[PDB]
Short mmCIF file of C-alpha atoms in Angstrom, two decimals:
data_model
loop_
_atom_site.label_atom_id
_atom_site.label_comp_id
_atom_site.label_asym_id
_atom_site.label_seq_id
_atom_site.Cartn_x
_atom_site.Cartn_y
_atom_site.Cartn_z
CA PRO A 1 -56.71 52.19 -4.37
CA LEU A 2 -59.63 54.50 -4.39
CA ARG A 3 -60.04 54.12 -8.17
CA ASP A 4 -60.95 50.45 -7.69
CA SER A 5 -63.41 51.36 -5.07
CA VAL A 6 -65.30 53.75 -7.28
CA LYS A 7 -65.30 51.03 -10.07
CA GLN A 8 -66.89 48.48 -7.72
CA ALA A 9 -69.43 50.95 -6.42
CA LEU A 10 -70.36 51.66 -10.03
CA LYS A 11 -70.51 47.91 -11.05
CA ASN A 12 -73.03 47.37 -8.22
CA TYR A 13 -75.01 50.45 -9.21
CA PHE A 14 -75.32 49.44 -12.92
CA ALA A 15 -76.46 46.04 -11.63
CA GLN A 16 -79.59 47.88 -10.17
CA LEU A 17 -80.61 49.75 -13.39
CA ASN A 18 -83.37 47.72 -15.26
CA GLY A 19 -84.24 49.90 -18.20
CA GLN A 20 -84.23 52.75 -15.54
CA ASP A 21 -82.66 55.80 -17.02
CA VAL A 22 -79.92 57.61 -15.24
CA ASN A 23 -79.10 61.04 -16.72
CA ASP A 24 -77.25 62.57 -13.80
CA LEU A 25 -74.42 60.05 -13.04
CA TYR A 26 -71.54 62.64 -13.09
CA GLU A 27 -73.23 64.98 -10.47
CA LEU A 28 -74.41 61.99 -8.48
CA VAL A 29 -70.88 60.61 -8.07
CA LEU A 30 -69.36 64.05 -7.71
CA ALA A 31 -71.80 64.98 -4.91
CA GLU A 32 -70.88 61.90 -2.96
CA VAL A 33 -67.11 62.33 -3.29
CA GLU A 34 -67.06 66.19 -2.88
CA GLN A 35 -69.09 65.99 0.38
CA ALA A 36 -66.69 63.37 1.81
CA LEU A 37 -63.66 65.40 0.78
CA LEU A 38 -64.92 68.73 2.14
CA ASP A 39 -65.88 66.92 5.35
CA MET A 40 -62.46 65.39 5.78
CA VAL A 41 -60.45 68.53 4.97
CA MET A 42 -62.63 70.77 7.25
CA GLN A 43 -62.14 68.30 10.07
CA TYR A 44 -58.34 68.23 9.54
CA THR A 45 -58.16 71.99 9.33
CA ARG A 46 -60.62 72.39 12.25
CA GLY A 47 -62.81 74.47 10.01
CA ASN A 48 -60.25 77.00 8.89
CA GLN A 49 -61.39 77.81 5.33
CA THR A 50 -58.18 79.48 4.06
CA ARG A 51 -56.16 76.45 5.15
CA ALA A 52 -58.62 73.98 3.66
CA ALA A 53 -58.72 75.83 0.32
CA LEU A 54 -54.87 75.98 0.15
CA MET A 55 -54.62 72.28 0.84
CA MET A 56 -57.19 71.53 -1.87
CA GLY A 57 -55.73 73.90 -4.40
CA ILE A 58 -58.97 75.81 -4.91
CA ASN A 59 -60.05 79.37 -4.38
CA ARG A 60 -61.50 80.13 -0.83
CA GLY A 61 -64.49 81.54 -2.68
CA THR A 62 -64.87 78.26 -4.50
CA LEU A 63 -64.62 76.31 -1.27
CA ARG A 64 -67.40 78.35 0.30
CA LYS A 65 -69.67 77.93 -2.83
CA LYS A 66 -69.26 74.18 -2.55
CA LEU A 67 -69.82 74.20 1.26
CA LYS A 68 -73.08 75.97 0.66
CA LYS A 69 -74.11 73.80 -2.37
CA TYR A 70 -74.08 70.79 -0.03
CA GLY A 71 -75.49 72.72 3.00
CA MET A 72 -72.22 72.46 5.02
CA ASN A 73 -72.18 76.27 5.54
CA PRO B 1 -71.01 53.48 0.74
CA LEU B 2 -68.59 55.11 -1.53
CA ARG B 3 -68.13 58.18 0.63
CA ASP B 4 -66.69 56.03 3.41
CA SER B 5 -64.06 54.65 1.08
CA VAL B 6 -63.23 58.26 0.16
CA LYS B 7 -62.97 59.15 3.84
CA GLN B 8 -60.77 56.14 4.69
CA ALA B 9 -58.53 56.96 1.73
CA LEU B 10 -58.13 60.60 2.87
CA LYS B 11 -57.65 59.53 6.51
CA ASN B 12 -54.74 57.32 5.40
CA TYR B 13 -53.33 59.99 3.09
CA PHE B 14 -53.31 62.64 5.95
CA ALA B 15 -51.62 60.05 8.23
CA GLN B 16 -48.79 60.13 5.62
CA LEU B 17 -48.62 63.94 5.86
CA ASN B 18 -45.93 64.29 8.55
CA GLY B 19 -44.79 67.98 7.97
CA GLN B 20 -45.20 67.74 4.09
CA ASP B 21 -47.60 70.21 2.55
CA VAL B 22 -50.38 69.34 0.10
CA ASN B 23 -51.63 71.97 -2.37
CA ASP B 24 -53.68 70.03 -4.97
CA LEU B 25 -55.81 67.59 -3.03
CA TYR B 26 -59.04 68.37 -5.02
CA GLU B 27 -57.21 67.54 -8.31
CA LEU B 28 -55.82 64.33 -6.88
CA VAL B 29 -59.25 62.97 -5.83
CA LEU B 30 -61.11 64.14 -8.91
CA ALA B 31 -58.53 62.63 -11.31
CA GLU B 32 -58.74 59.33 -9.49
CA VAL B 33 -62.56 59.33 -9.53
CA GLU B 34 -63.22 60.72 -13.04
CA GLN B 35 -60.97 58.04 -14.48
CA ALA B 36 -62.81 55.18 -12.81
CA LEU B 37 -66.22 56.61 -13.76
CA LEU B 38 -65.26 57.27 -17.48
CA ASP B 39 -63.88 53.72 -17.69
CA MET B 40 -67.01 52.14 -16.17
CA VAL B 41 -69.47 54.25 -18.21
CA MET B 42 -67.68 53.56 -21.59
CA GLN B 43 -67.72 49.83 -20.88
CA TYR B 44 -71.45 50.00 -19.96
CA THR B 45 -72.35 51.91 -23.10
CA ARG B 46 -70.00 49.64 -25.19
CA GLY B 47 -67.93 52.66 -26.35
CA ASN B 48 -70.86 54.75 -27.48
CA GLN B 49 -69.97 58.33 -26.52
CA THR B 50 -73.49 59.85 -27.00
CA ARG B 51 -75.21 57.26 -24.71
CA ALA B 52 -72.40 57.74 -22.16
CA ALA B 53 -72.74 61.55 -22.14
CA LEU B 54 -76.54 61.27 -21.75
CA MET B 55 -76.21 58.87 -18.80
CA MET B 56 -73.71 61.16 -17.20
CA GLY B 57 -75.73 64.27 -17.81
CA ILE B 58 -72.88 66.01 -19.63
CA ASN B 59 -72.65 66.96 -23.31
CA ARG B 60 -70.50 65.01 -25.79
CA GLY B 61 -67.57 67.45 -26.00
CA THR B 62 -67.18 67.75 -22.23
CA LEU B 63 -66.97 63.96 -22.16
CA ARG B 64 -64.40 64.04 -24.97
CA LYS B 65 -62.21 66.66 -23.23
CA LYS B 66 -62.12 64.38 -20.17
CA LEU B 67 -61.37 61.18 -22.13
CA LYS B 68 -58.40 62.97 -23.74
CA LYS B 69 -57.16 64.21 -20.32
CA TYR B 70 -56.80 60.68 -19.09
CA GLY B 71 -55.74 59.30 -22.51
CA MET B 72 -58.93 57.42 -23.36
CA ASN B 73 -59.60 58.66 -26.92
#
């Protein structure tokens, strides 16, 4: 289950903090997961953005903002 | 690397998609990830919501809205 995989990835990450602040953990995890998701849906859809946005349940405009945020368009 | 576990999880989910449509895939992945992250951060901060919001980079009420969504306060 994916949920157990992000818990383990986070256990190992907290094991590397030694008094090192982290003040961006939400965007850091979100950037990793959103890039993987956009990558996988665009590959399945062969780059069709309307199809990809319908499958994800987001606006095609939103899809393209995210594609550009991560430099994937 | 977490993003590979996300890709393997999506690769297996699309293999289950034989003619069935999907229309909420972003919500499915986010819900699964935000729950594992809110659980791991609250344990690390020993339940302190202000230290958890600062580590995450979000403000306290955003963090509270999300805890409620997943029944965690």
